[PDB]
Amino acid sequence: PITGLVYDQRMMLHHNMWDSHHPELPQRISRIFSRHEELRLLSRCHRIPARLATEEELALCHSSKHISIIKSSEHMKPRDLNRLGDEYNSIFISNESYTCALLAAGSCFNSAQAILTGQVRNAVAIVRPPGHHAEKDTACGFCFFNTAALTARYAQSITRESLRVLIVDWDVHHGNGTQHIFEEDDSVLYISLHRYEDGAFFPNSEDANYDKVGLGKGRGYNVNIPWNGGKMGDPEYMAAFHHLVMPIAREFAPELVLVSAGFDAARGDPLGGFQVTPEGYAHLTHQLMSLAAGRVLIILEGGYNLTSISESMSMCTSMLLGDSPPSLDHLTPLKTSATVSINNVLRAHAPFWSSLR
Ligand SMILES: NNC(=O)c1ccc(Cn2cc(-c3ccc(N=C4NCCN4)cc3)nn2)cc1
Ligand SMILES: [K+]
Ligand SMILES: [K+]
Ligand SMILES: [Zn+2]
Numbered sequence: 001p002i003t004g005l006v007y008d009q010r011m012m013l014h015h016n017m018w019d020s021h022h023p024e025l026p027q028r029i030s031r032i033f034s035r036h037e038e039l040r041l042l043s044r045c046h047r048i049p050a051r052l053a054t055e056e057e058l059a060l061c062h063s064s065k066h067i068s069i070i071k072s073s074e075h076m077k078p079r080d081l082n083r084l085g086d087e088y089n090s091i092f093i094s095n096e097s098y099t100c101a102l103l104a105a106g107s108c109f110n111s112a113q114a115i116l117t118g119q120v121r122n123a124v125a126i127v128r129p130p131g132h133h134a135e136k137d138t139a140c141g142f143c144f145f146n147t148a149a150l151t152a153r154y155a156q157s158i159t160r161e162s163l164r165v166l167i168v169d170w171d172v173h174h175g176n177g178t179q180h181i182f183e184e185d186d187s188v189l190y191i192s193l194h195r196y197e198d199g200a201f202f203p204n205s206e207d208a209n210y211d212k213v214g215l216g217k218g219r220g221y222n223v224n225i226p227w228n229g230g231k232m233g234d235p236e237y238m239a240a241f242h243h244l245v246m247p248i249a250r251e252f253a254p255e256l257v258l259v260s261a262g263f264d265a266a267r268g269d270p271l272g273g274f275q276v277t278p279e280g281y282a283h284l285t286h287q288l289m290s291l292a293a294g295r296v297l298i299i300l301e302g303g304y305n306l307t308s309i310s311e312s313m314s315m316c317t318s319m320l321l322g323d324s325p326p327s328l329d330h331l332t333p334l335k336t337s338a339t340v341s342i343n344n345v346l347r348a349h350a351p352f353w354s355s356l357r
Contacts, residue, residue, distance in 0.1 A: 171262025220352025263303030
């Protein structure tokens with residue numbers, strides 16, 4: 001089997017002009033890439049080139065209005081960049097932002113194409129800016145275009161409309177954009193695990209609760225696993241995979257697995273407040289490799305501790321390359337609040353999945 005890797009230093013050019021310390025730093029991707037070199041993982045991978053997404057590809061998920069507004073930021077003066085950033089929840093924009101967001105999406109399209117043609121078995125995309133909060137009509141939470149949603153649609157566009165795509169989002173935040181784009185769709189199964197805190201955690205919406213199971217023919221194809229009152233870690237994520245993610249995924253029988261792989265649930269993240277370890281991430285990756293005949297694309301989303309994200313994403317690539325999962329030492333017993341979350345999702349989804357009845 002061959003593992004693809006896409007990384008292009010051009011995605012570093014998107015930057016916060018008036019807050020150089022903003023957590024969504026350029027060096028997130030260079031630090032992840034440098035860790036791959038230190039661990040000698042880069043020479044074991046087939047390098048997939050980045051490319052720009054086309055406007056026609058962006059229109060698979062986004063409105064003409066949204067594409068045109070973000071495109072226009074490439075030519076804006078600083079005052080207009082600052083004003084446009086302020087139209088959105090948690091966005092900064094530079095004149096390089098649009099091109100970086102196009103490269104993040106086209107990198108993922110090239111990776112998906114490599115996987116579906118069998119040029120590679122699996123792949124990792126070290127990309128920024130992130131994607132999962134972007135909606136059809138709006139940018140949000142450091143995201144301009146929904147890289148993972150667009151990749152699922154691009155995959156369907158080069159195979160067949162009904163190609164079965166699983167998106168697993170283990171970023172500590174709910175992928176509100178991904179959920180909304182696929183809410184009525186049974187061809188794309190969206191499974192998110194996220195800090196929820198009864199709706200108080202970003203992005204601050206009851207849309208992220210367990211009772212949002214999808215709409216119309218999409219009912220049962222949106223799986224929210226919300227965490228409340230607890231610093232969740234490896235035991236909680238392992239229990240969620242065992243009871244919910246893997247049984248549902250096997251029954252859906254995906255032909256492609258996209259991971260919205262934020263590492264902001266990692267031990268040491270300044271924003272997440274959780275304690276998933278790099279070995280924890282390796283175990284989750286290794287379980288997803290059992291789906292879709294191993295056709296897994298890992299796409300970087302959030303994660304703001306440069307050392308944590310570099311160790312965590314490298315451990316994931318190691319698993320894609322066939323290395324044995326490292327053992328999980330220091331497994332505390334499952335938090336009560338996590339058992340309740342898992343039970344509530346099981347009850348919400350039992351009507352839709354015979355593997356949960
Ligand atoms: N996947 N989604 C996310 O990861 C995700 C994570 C968070 C948010 C919302 N948001 C924004 C910031 C923020 C922090 C620090 C900051 N700047 C400085 N500089 C000096 C001191 N602090 C500027 C903004 N903190 N929470 C949205 C999406
Ligand atoms: K998530
Ligand atoms: K769906
Ligand atoms: Zn996040």
